[PDB]
Coordinates of C-alpha atoms in Angstrom, one line a residue:
Chain A
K10 CA -3.1 -5.2 -33.8
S11 CA -6.1 -2.8 -34.1
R12 CA -8.7 -3.3 -31.4
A13 CA -11.3 -1.7 -33.7
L14 CA -14.1 -3.5 -35.5
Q15 CA -13.2 -4.5 -39.1
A16 CA -15.2 -5.1 -42.3
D17 CA -14.7 -6.6 -45.7
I18 CA -17.2 -4.1 -47.1
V19 CA -18.5 -0.6 -46.7
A20 CA -22.0 -0.4 -48.2
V21 CA -23.2 3.1 -49.0
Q22 CA -26.9 3.4 -49.8
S23 CA -30.4 3.9 -48.4
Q24 CA -31.7 2.8 -45.1
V25 CA -35.3 2.1 -44.1
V26 CA -36.8 1.8 -40.6
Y27 CA -39.5 -0.5 -42.2
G28 CA -38.7 -2.5 -45.3
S29 CA -36.0 -4.4 -47.2
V30 CA -34.2 -2.0 -49.5
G31 CA -30.7 -0.5 -49.5
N32 CA -28.6 -1.6 -46.5
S33 CA -31.6 -2.9 -44.7
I34 CA -31.5 -5.9 -47.0
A35 CA -27.9 -5.8 -48.2
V36 CA -26.3 -5.9 -44.7
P37 CA -28.0 -9.1 -43.6
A38 CA -27.4 -10.6 -47.0
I39 CA -23.7 -9.8 -46.7
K40 CA -23.7 -11.2 -43.2
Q41 CA -25.2 -14.4 -44.5
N42 CA -22.1 -14.9 -46.7
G43 CA -19.9 -14.7 -43.7
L44 CA -18.6 -11.2 -44.4
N45 CA -18.5 -8.1 -42.3
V46 CA -19.8 -4.7 -43.4
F47 CA -20.2 -1.2 -42.2
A48 CA -23.3 0.5 -43.6
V49 CA -23.3 4.2 -44.4
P50 CA -26.8 5.7 -45.0
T51 CA -27.4 8.1 -47.8
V52 CA -31.0 8.6 -47.0
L53 CA -33.0 7.4 -43.9
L54 CA -36.6 6.7 -44.8
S55 CA -39.5 5.1 -42.9
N56 CA -40.1 3.0 -45.9
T57 CA -39.7 3.2 -49.7
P58 CA -41.6 6.1 -51.4
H59 CA -43.8 3.5 -53.2
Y60 CA -46.2 3.2 -50.2
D61 CA -49.1 5.5 -49.6
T62 CA -46.8 7.5 -47.2
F63 CA -43.1 7.8 -46.4
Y64 CA -41.1 10.0 -44.1
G65 CA -37.4 10.8 -43.7
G66 CA -34.8 12.3 -46.0
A67 CA -31.2 12.6 -47.2
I68 CA -28.4 12.4 -44.7
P69 CA -26.8 15.8 -44.3
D70 CA -23.5 16.3 -46.2
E71 CA -21.7 17.0 -42.9
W72 CA -23.1 13.9 -41.3
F73 CA -22.4 11.8 -44.4
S74 CA -18.9 13.1 -44.8
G75 CA -18.4 12.5 -41.1
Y76 CA -19.6 8.8 -41.3
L77 CA -17.0 8.0 -44.0
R78 CA -14.2 9.9 -42.3
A79 CA -15.0 8.2 -38.9
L80 CA -14.3 4.8 -40.5
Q81 CA -10.8 6.0 -41.1
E82 CA -10.3 7.8 -37.8
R83 CA -11.5 4.7 -36.0
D84 CA -9.0 2.6 -37.9
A85 CA -11.7 0.2 -38.9
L86 CA -10.5 -0.4 -42.5
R87 CA -7.6 -2.8 -42.0
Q88 CA -9.7 -5.5 -43.7
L89 CA -11.4 -3.4 -46.4
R90 CA -11.7 -5.2 -49.7
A91 CA -14.7 -3.5 -51.3
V92 CA -17.0 -0.5 -51.3
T93 CA -20.4 -0.8 -52.9
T94 CA -22.6 2.2 -53.8
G95 CA -26.4 2.2 -54.2
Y96 CA -29.2 4.7 -53.9
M97 CA -27.7 8.1 -53.3
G98 CA -29.5 11.1 -51.8
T99 CA -27.7 14.0 -53.5
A100 CA -25.0 14.8 -56.0
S101 CA -23.1 16.4 -53.1
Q102 CA -23.0 13.0 -51.3
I103 CA -21.6 11.4 -54.5
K104 CA -18.8 14.0 -54.8
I105 CA -18.0 13.5 -51.1
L106 CA -18.1 9.8 -51.5
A107 CA -15.8 10.0 -54.6
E108 CA -13.3 12.1 -52.7
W109 CA -13.3 9.6 -49.8
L110 CA -12.8 6.8 -52.3
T111 CA -10.0 8.6 -54.1
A112 CA -8.3 8.9 -50.7
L113 CA -8.7 5.2 -49.9
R114 CA -7.1 3.8 -53.0
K115 CA -3.8 5.3 -51.9
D116 CA -3.8 2.9 -48.9
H117 CA -6.0 0.2 -50.5
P118 CA -4.5 -0.3 -54.0
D119 CA -6.7 -3.4 -54.5
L120 CA -9.9 -1.9 -53.3
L121 CA -12.8 -3.2 -55.4
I122 CA -15.3 -0.3 -55.9
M123 CA -18.7 -1.5 -57.2
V124 CA -21.3 1.1 -58.0
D125 CA -25.0 0.6 -58.8
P126 CA -26.0 3.7 -60.8
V127 CA -29.5 4.0 -59.5
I128 CA -31.0 6.8 -61.6
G129 CA -34.2 5.5 -63.1
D130 CA -35.7 3.6 -66.0
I131 CA -37.8 4.2 -69.2
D132 CA -41.3 5.2 -68.2
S133 CA -40.8 8.7 -66.7
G134 CA -37.0 8.6 -66.7
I135 CA -34.9 9.8 -63.7
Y136 CA -36.7 9.0 -60.4
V137 CA -33.9 10.2 -58.2
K138 CA -32.4 13.7 -57.5
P139 CA -32.0 15.3 -61.0
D140 CA -28.3 16.2 -60.3
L141 CA -27.3 12.6 -59.6
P142 CA -26.5 11.6 -63.3
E143 CA -23.8 14.2 -63.9
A144 CA -22.4 13.4 -60.5
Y145 CA -22.1 9.7 -61.4
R146 CA -20.5 10.5 -64.8
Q147 CA -18.1 13.0 -63.3
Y148 CA -17.0 11.7 -60.0
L149 CA -18.1 8.1 -59.2
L150 CA -18.1 6.3 -62.6
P151 CA -14.3 7.0 -63.1
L152 CA -13.6 5.1 -59.9
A153 CA -15.7 2.0 -60.3
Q154 CA -14.3 -1.4 -61.1
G155 CA -17.7 -2.6 -61.9
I156 CA -21.2 -1.1 -62.5
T157 CA -24.7 -2.6 -62.6
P158 CA -26.9 -0.3 -64.7
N159 CA -30.2 -1.1 -66.3
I160 CA -30.8 -0.1 -69.9
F161 CA -32.0 3.4 -69.2
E162 CA -29.1 4.0 -66.8
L163 CA -26.5 2.8 -69.3
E164 CA -28.0 5.3 -71.8
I165 CA -27.8 8.2 -69.3
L166 CA -24.2 7.2 -68.5
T167 CA -23.0 6.8 -72.1
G168 CA -25.4 9.1 -73.9
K169 CA -26.1 6.2 -76.3
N170 CA -29.3 4.4 -77.3
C171 CA -29.0 0.9 -75.7
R172 CA -32.4 -0.6 -76.7
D173 CA -30.8 -3.3 -78.9
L174 CA -28.3 -5.8 -77.3
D175 CA -25.5 -5.1 -79.8
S176 CA -26.0 -1.4 -79.0
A177 CA -26.0 -1.9 -75.2
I178 CA -22.8 -4.1 -75.6
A179 CA -21.0 -1.4 -77.6
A180 CA -22.0 1.3 -75.1
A181 CA -20.8 -0.9 -72.2
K182 CA -17.6 -1.6 -74.0
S183 CA -17.0 2.1 -74.6
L184 CA -17.0 2.5 -70.8
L185 CA -14.4 -0.1 -70.0
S186 CA -10.9 1.2 -69.1
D187 CA -7.9 0.4 -66.9
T188 CA -10.2 1.1 -64.0
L189 CA -13.6 -0.1 -65.1
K190 CA -13.3 -3.9 -65.5
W191 CA -16.9 -4.9 -66.1
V192 CA -20.4 -3.7 -66.8
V193 CA -23.4 -5.8 -65.8
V194 CA -26.4 -4.7 -67.8
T195 CA -29.9 -5.7 -66.6
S196 CA -32.7 -5.6 -69.1
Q204 CA -41.3 -13.1 -69.7
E205 CA -37.6 -13.2 -69.0
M206 CA -34.9 -11.0 -67.4
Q207 CA -31.7 -10.4 -69.3
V208 CA -28.5 -9.9 -67.4
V209 CA -25.5 -9.1 -69.7
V210 CA -22.0 -9.3 -68.4
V211 CA -19.5 -7.2 -70.4
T212 CA -15.7 -7.2 -70.1
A213 CA -13.0 -6.1 -72.4
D214 CA -12.7 -9.5 -73.9
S215 CA -16.1 -11.1 -73.4
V216 CA -19.9 -10.9 -73.3
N217 CA -22.0 -13.4 -71.3
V218 CA -25.8 -13.3 -71.6
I219 CA -27.7 -14.7 -68.7
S220 CA -31.5 -15.1 -69.0
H221 CA -33.6 -15.9 -66.0
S222 CA -37.3 -16.7 -66.2
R223 CA -38.6 -13.9 -64.0
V224 CA -42.1 -12.7 -63.2
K225 CA -42.9 -9.0 -62.9
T226 CA -43.2 -8.1 -59.2
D227 CA -43.8 -5.0 -57.1
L228 CA -41.2 -6.2 -54.5
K229 CA -38.6 -3.5 -54.0
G230 CA -34.9 -3.8 -53.1
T231 CA -34.1 -6.7 -55.5
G232 CA -31.4 -4.6 -57.1
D233 CA -29.8 -4.0 -53.7
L234 CA -30.1 -7.7 -52.8
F235 CA -28.5 -8.5 -56.2
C236 CA -25.4 -6.3 -55.7
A237 CA -25.1 -7.5 -52.1
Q238 CA -24.9 -11.2 -53.2
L239 CA -22.7 -10.3 -56.2
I240 CA -20.0 -8.6 -54.2
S241 CA -20.1 -11.3 -51.6
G242 CA -19.5 -13.9 -54.4
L243 CA -16.6 -11.9 -55.9
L244 CA -15.0 -11.5 -52.5
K245 CA -15.4 -15.2 -51.8
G246 CA -13.6 -16.2 -54.9
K247 CA -16.3 -16.7 -57.5
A248 CA -15.4 -15.9 -61.1
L249 CA -17.4 -12.8 -62.4
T250 CA -20.0 -14.5 -64.6
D251 CA -20.7 -17.3 -62.1
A252 CA -20.9 -14.6 -59.4
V253 CA -23.5 -12.7 -61.5
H254 CA -25.5 -15.8 -62.2
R255 CA -25.6 -16.9 -58.5
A256 CA -26.5 -13.4 -57.4
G257 CA -29.4 -13.5 -59.9
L258 CA -30.5 -16.9 -58.6
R259 CA -30.4 -15.8 -55.0
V260 CA -32.6 -12.9 -55.8
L261 CA -35.1 -15.1 -57.6
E262 CA -35.0 -17.5 -54.6
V263 CA -35.6 -14.7 -52.1
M264 CA -38.5 -13.4 -54.2
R265 CA -40.0 -16.9 -54.2
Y266 CA -39.6 -17.3 -50.5
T267 CA -41.0 -13.8 -49.9
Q268 CA -44.1 -14.5 -52.0
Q269 CA -44.6 -17.9 -50.4
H270 CA -44.4 -16.0 -47.2
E271 CA -47.1 -13.7 -48.6
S272 CA -45.1 -10.6 -47.7
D273 CA -44.9 -7.2 -49.4
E274 CA -41.3 -6.8 -48.3
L275 CA -38.3 -9.1 -49.0
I276 CA -37.6 -11.7 -46.4
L277 CA -34.3 -13.6 -46.4
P278 CA -34.3 -17.4 -46.3
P279 CA -31.1 -19.0 -45.2
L280 CA -28.3 -19.2 -47.7
Chain B
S2 CA -50.9 -7.5 -29.7
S3 CA -53.9 -6.6 -31.8
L4 CA -57.2 -7.8 -30.4
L5 CA -59.0 -7.6 -33.8
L6 CA -59.9 -11.3 -34.3
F7 CA -61.8 -10.1 -37.4
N8 CA -58.8 -8.3 -38.9
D9 CA -57.8 -9.5 -42.4
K10 CA -54.3 -10.9 -43.0
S11 CA -51.5 -8.3 -43.1
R12 CA -48.8 -8.7 -45.7
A13 CA -46.4 -6.4 -43.9
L14 CA -43.4 -7.5 -41.9
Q15 CA -44.3 -8.0 -38.2
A16 CA -42.2 -7.3 -35.2
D17 CA -42.3 -8.2 -31.5
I18 CA -40.5 -5.1 -30.4
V19 CA -39.9 -1.6 -31.5
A20 CA -36.7 -0.3 -30.1
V21 CA -36.2 3.5 -30.0
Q22 CA -32.6 4.5 -29.4
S23 CA -29.4 5.8 -30.9
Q24 CA -27.7 4.2 -33.9
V25 CA -24.0 4.2 -34.9
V26 CA -22.5 3.5 -38.2
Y27 CA -19.4 2.2 -36.4
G28 CA -19.8 0.5 -33.0
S29 CA -22.1 -1.4 -30.7
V30 CA -24.3 1.0 -28.7
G31 CA -28.1 1.6 -28.9
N32 CA -29.9 -0.4 -31.6
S33 CA -26.6 -1.3 -33.2
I34 CA -26.1 -3.8 -30.4
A35 CA -29.7 -4.3 -29.3
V36 CA -31.1 -5.3 -32.6
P37 CA -28.6 -8.2 -33.2
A38 CA -29.0 -9.3 -29.6
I39 CA -32.7 -9.3 -29.9
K40 CA -32.4 -11.2 -33.2
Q41 CA -30.3 -13.8 -31.4
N42 CA -33.2 -14.5 -29.1
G43 CA -35.4 -15.3 -32.0
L44 CA -37.5 -12.1 -31.9
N45 CA -38.2 -9.6 -34.6
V46 CA -37.6 -5.9 -34.1
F47 CA -38.0 -2.5 -35.8
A48 CA -35.3 0.0 -35.0
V49 CA -36.2 3.7 -34.8
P50 CA -33.2 6.0 -34.3
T51 CA -33.1 9.0 -32.1
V52 CA -29.6 10.0 -33.3
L53 CA -27.5 8.7 -36.1
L54 CA -23.8 9.0 -35.2
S55 CA -20.6 7.7 -36.8
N56 CA -19.7 6.3 -33.4
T57 CA -20.1 7.1 -29.7
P58 CA -19.0 10.6 -28.6
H59 CA -16.4 8.9 -26.4
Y60 CA -13.8 8.5 -29.2
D61 CA -11.6 11.4 -30.3
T62 CA -14.0 12.3 -33.1
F63 CA -17.7 11.6 -33.9
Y64 CA -20.2 12.9 -36.3
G65 CA -24.0 13.0 -36.9
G66 CA -26.8 14.2 -34.8
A67 CA -30.4 13.9 -33.6
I68 CA -33.1 12.7 -36.0
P69 CA -35.3 15.6 -37.0
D70 CA -38.7 15.7 -35.2
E71 CA -40.5 15.4 -38.6
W72 CA -38.5 12.3 -39.6
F73 CA -38.7 10.8 -36.1
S74 CA -42.5 11.3 -35.8
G75 CA -42.8 10.0 -39.4
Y76 CA -40.9 6.8 -38.6
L77 CA -43.2 6.0 -35.7
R78 CA -46.3 6.9 -37.8
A79 CA -45.1 4.8 -40.7
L80 CA -45.0 1.7 -38.5
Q81 CA -48.7 2.2 -37.9
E82 CA -49.6 3.1 -41.5
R83 CA -47.6 0.1 -42.8
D84 CA -49.8 -2.0 -40.5
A85 CA -46.7 -3.8 -39.2
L86 CA -47.7 -3.9 -35.5
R87 CA -50.0 -6.9 -35.3
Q88 CA -47.4 -8.8 -33.3
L89 CA -46.2 -5.9 -31.3
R90 CA -45.7 -6.9 -27.7
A91 CA -43.2 -4.3 -26.5
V92 CA -41.5 -0.9 -27.1
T93 CA -38.2 -0.2 -25.5
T94 CA -36.7 3.3 -25.1
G95 CA -33.1 4.2 -24.6
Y96 CA -30.9 7.2 -25.3
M97 CA -33.2 10.0 -26.5
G98 CA -31.9 12.9 -28.7
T99 CA -34.2 15.6 -27.4
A100 CA -37.1 16.4 -25.2
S101 CA -39.2 16.9 -28.3
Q102 CA -38.6 13.4 -29.4
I103 CA -39.7 12.2 -26.0
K104 CA -43.0 14.1 -26.4
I105 CA -43.4 12.7 -29.9
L106 CA -42.7 9.2 -28.8
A107 CA -45.0 9.5 -25.8
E108 CA -47.9 10.6 -28.0
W109 CA -47.3 7.8 -30.4
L110 CA -47.3 5.4 -27.4
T111 CA -50.5 6.7 -25.8
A112 CA -52.3 6.2 -29.1
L113 CA -50.8 2.7 -29.5
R114 CA -51.8 1.6 -25.9
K115 CA -55.4 1.9 -27.0
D116 CA -55.1 -0.9 -29.6
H117 CA -52.4 -2.8 -27.7
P118 CA -53.6 -3.3 -24.1
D119 CA -50.8 -5.9 -23.5
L120 CA -48.1 -3.5 -24.6
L121 CA -45.0 -3.7 -22.4
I122 CA -43.4 -0.2 -22.5
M123 CA -39.9 -0.5 -21.1
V124 CA -38.0 2.7 -20.5
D125 CA -34.3 3.2 -19.9
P126 CA -34.0 6.7 -18.4
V127 CA -30.7 7.6 -19.9
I128 CA -30.0 10.9 -18.2
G129 CA -26.4 12.1 -17.7
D130 CA -23.0 11.1 -19.0
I131 CA -19.7 10.0 -17.4
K138 CA -29.7 19.7 -19.2
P139 CA -33.1 20.5 -17.5
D140 CA -35.0 19.7 -20.7
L141 CA -34.8 15.9 -20.6
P142 CA -35.7 15.0 -17.0
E143 CA -39.0 16.9 -17.2
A144 CA -39.9 15.3 -20.6
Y145 CA -39.5 11.9 -19.0
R146 CA -41.6 12.8 -16.0
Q147 CA -44.4 14.4 -18.0
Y148 CA -44.6 12.1 -20.9
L149 CA -42.8 8.7 -20.7
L150 CA -42.8 7.9 -17.1
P151 CA -46.6 7.7 -16.9
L152 CA -46.6 5.2 -19.7
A153 CA -43.8 2.8 -18.8
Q154 CA -44.6 -0.6 -17.4
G155 CA -41.0 -1.0 -16.3
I156 CA -37.9 1.3 -16.0
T157 CA -34.2 0.6 -15.6
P158 CA -32.5 3.6 -13.9
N159 CA -29.1 3.6 -12.2
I160 CA -28.9 5.4 -8.8
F161 CA -28.3 8.8 -10.3
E162 CA -31.2 8.5 -12.8
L163 CA -33.5 7.2 -10.0
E164 CA -32.6 10.3 -8.0
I165 CA -33.1 12.7 -10.9
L166 CA -36.6 11.3 -11.8
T167 CA -37.8 11.2 -8.2
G168 CA -35.8 14.1 -6.7
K169 CA -35.2 11.8 -3.7
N170 CA -32.0 10.6 -2.1
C171 CA -31.1 7.0 -2.8
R172 CA -27.8 6.4 -1.0
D173 CA -28.8 3.3 0.8
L174 CA -30.9 0.1 0.1
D175 CA -34.1 1.2 1.9
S176 CA -34.1 4.7 0.4
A177 CA -33.4 3.4 -3.1
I178 CA -36.2 0.9 -2.7
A179 CA -38.5 3.7 -1.2
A180 CA -37.9 5.9 -4.3
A181 CA -38.5 3.0 -6.7
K182 CA -41.7 2.1 -4.8
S183 CA -42.9 5.6 -5.1
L184 CA -42.8 5.4 -8.9
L185 CA -45.0 2.2 -9.0
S186 CA -48.6 2.6 -10.1
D187 CA -51.3 0.6 -12.0
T188 CA -49.2 1.2 -15.1
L189 CA -45.6 1.1 -13.7
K190 CA -45.2 -2.5 -12.6
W191 CA -41.5 -2.7 -11.9
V192 CA -38.3 -0.7 -11.3
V193 CA -34.9 -2.2 -11.9
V194 CA -32.3 0.0 -10.3
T195 CA -28.6 -0.8 -10.8
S196 CA -25.4 0.7 -9.4
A197 CA -21.8 0.0 -10.6
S198 CA -19.5 0.1 -7.6
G199 CA -15.9 0.6 -8.8
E202 CA -10.2 -3.2 -10.1
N203 CA -13.5 -5.1 -10.1
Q204 CA -16.6 -3.1 -10.3
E205 CA -19.6 -4.6 -8.6
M206 CA -23.0 -4.5 -10.4
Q207 CA -25.5 -4.1 -7.7
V208 CA -29.1 -4.6 -8.8
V209 CA -32.4 -4.1 -7.1
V210 CA -35.6 -5.4 -8.7
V211 CA -38.6 -3.7 -7.2
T212 CA -42.3 -4.4 -7.6
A213 CA -45.4 -3.7 -5.6
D214 CA -45.3 -7.0 -3.8
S215 CA -41.5 -7.9 -3.8
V216 CA -38.0 -6.8 -3.6
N217 CA -35.2 -8.9 -5.0
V218 CA -31.5 -8.1 -5.3
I219 CA -28.8 -9.3 -7.6
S220 CA -25.0 -8.9 -7.4
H221 CA -22.5 -9.5 -10.3
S222 CA -18.8 -8.9 -10.3
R223 CA -17.5 -7.0 -13.4
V224 CA -14.0 -6.1 -14.6
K225 CA -13.6 -2.4 -15.1
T226 CA -14.0 -1.6 -18.8
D227 CA -14.4 1.4 -21.2
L228 CA -16.8 -0.6 -23.3
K229 CA -20.0 1.2 -24.1
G230 CA -23.5 -0.1 -24.9
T231 CA -23.6 -2.7 -22.1
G232 CA -26.7 -1.0 -20.7
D233 CA -28.4 -1.1 -24.1
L234 CA -27.4 -4.8 -24.3
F235 CA -28.8 -5.5 -20.9
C236 CA -32.1 -4.0 -21.8
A237 CA -32.2 -5.9 -25.1
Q238 CA -31.7 -9.2 -23.2
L239 CA -34.1 -8.1 -20.5
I240 CA -37.0 -7.5 -22.8
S241 CA -36.1 -10.6 -24.8
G242 CA -36.1 -12.6 -21.6
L243 CA -39.4 -11.3 -20.5
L244 CA -41.0 -11.8 -23.9
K245 CA -39.8 -15.4 -23.9
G246 CA -41.5 -16.3 -20.6
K247 CA -38.8 -15.6 -18.1
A248 CA -39.9 -14.2 -14.7
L249 CA -38.7 -10.6 -13.9
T250 CA -35.9 -11.5 -11.5
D251 CA -34.8 -14.4 -13.6
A252 CA -34.8 -12.3 -16.7
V253 CA -32.8 -9.6 -14.9
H254 CA -30.3 -12.1 -13.6
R255 CA -29.9 -13.8 -17.0
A256 CA -29.7 -10.4 -18.8
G257 CA -26.8 -9.5 -16.5
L258 CA -25.0 -12.8 -17.1
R259 CA -25.4 -12.5 -20.9
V260 CA -23.9 -9.1 -20.7
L261 CA -21.0 -10.3 -18.7
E262 CA -20.6 -13.2 -21.3
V263 CA -20.5 -10.7 -24.1
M264 CA -18.0 -8.4 -22.4
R265 CA -15.6 -11.3 -21.7
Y266 CA -15.9 -12.5 -25.3
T267 CA -15.2 -8.9 -26.4
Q268 CA -12.1 -8.7 -24.3
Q269 CA -11.1 -12.3 -25.3
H270 CA -10.9 -10.9 -28.8
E271 CA -9.3 -7.6 -27.6
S272 CA -12.1 -5.5 -29.2
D273 CA -12.9 -1.9 -28.1
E274 CA -16.5 -2.5 -29.2
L275 CA -18.9 -5.2 -28.0
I276 CA -19.1 -8.2 -30.3
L277 CA -21.9 -10.8 -29.8
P278 CA -20.9 -14.5 -29.4
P279 CA -23.5 -17.2 -30.1
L280 CA -26.5 -17.4 -27.8

């Protein structure tokens, strides 16, 4: 009966004027799967910070809080089935996001919250706002149904060394709960490990080291789409991984420094 | 379009258009409707926001604001530094957040014009609603750079300070804005139930008029959509009047479709 626009997903992450990272790549990827999505920016950059220059910044708490609240006040969540989180600007955004999410669950008992704990890697460590980690551990993590950390991020979230697979698995297992259903850990091959309370599925893709950014965001985008379209978890992870590899190939064949989406 | 035949291959994304307007998390106004419409036409575009709102200020609540000058200027500068303008054929302007953004945009444009002689700068003089600052910014900075403008009667009067309450006068004012740079003026007036969309296309050598019938609606963004389809039409070979006519029909088509689905926000049907 609502006359408002609806969406299957609310994607909360970065946005670039130029480039294919955050919602700039996730939205069209999600659209490709035949799903609707409202994108809520956490940062608005001209391009990723990896280039010689970059401009823009974090979306003000008041604006950010307003964007989320507006989706409710506009009654545009009648079809909401998932909320994905990616690159966050500040801890304050995470706390606000968590509060918004806690509020939603009361009306969307089946809401699938998928969070990508973008914090960093092992080379210099945390390449995002220093206060993000604690914010993830305190407010957001407790709400996630699934998470997609890399080794370093799983270590920061669990406070456990995860260099060895068996160690990463135990760490991921220790995170599972009535709320947290799965942990997808990403590690010349790429290792993607799917962990649930009763299983562990290791997926290895022959991947070549690239400088292309946003693949993690593309990954999560294709993953949630698959889960929402009825794909079993592992299959959904594998397909997401394959779509990413495919896009990277298409992009390189296109001789482009930014991800370009081929048809699905 | 870059004239450097000797330029090496750029690996950056390329775009035919750079649309500078508002953006809404929820809704179909500004680039939120223009980008998808442009995409439908098979063109590429870079969206540079002037304001990032939760939705239009027409609803009961709305949040967000104007993009800071530093960010705004940076976004425009980044497009140059990323070398993503080799295919740039046009820059459209819509709702501007502040006069300072207009100055910043204009400076960026003057610079660009030097490397893109074929640049079609199309300006939509969004002034007014249902502030001295904005009108003057347009007159000093953007007006002297535009190749074409799409004002309604009120905006045409504001920019020129002339009375345009009759065909001849409206034409006269539009003609007065023409120059070696300003090639055309598209003035429209919604007569309000079945609102009539009166349109007058004015150039140095001709005057053409278009008239569409429209059902009264609260739908927002139709003007931004019109512009998106206009620039798209022009970039795909359509002659001015033909492009204006088609842009108007496409808008009507989108509005009907929107109503057909009983939506309070524009939704694009196939093209």
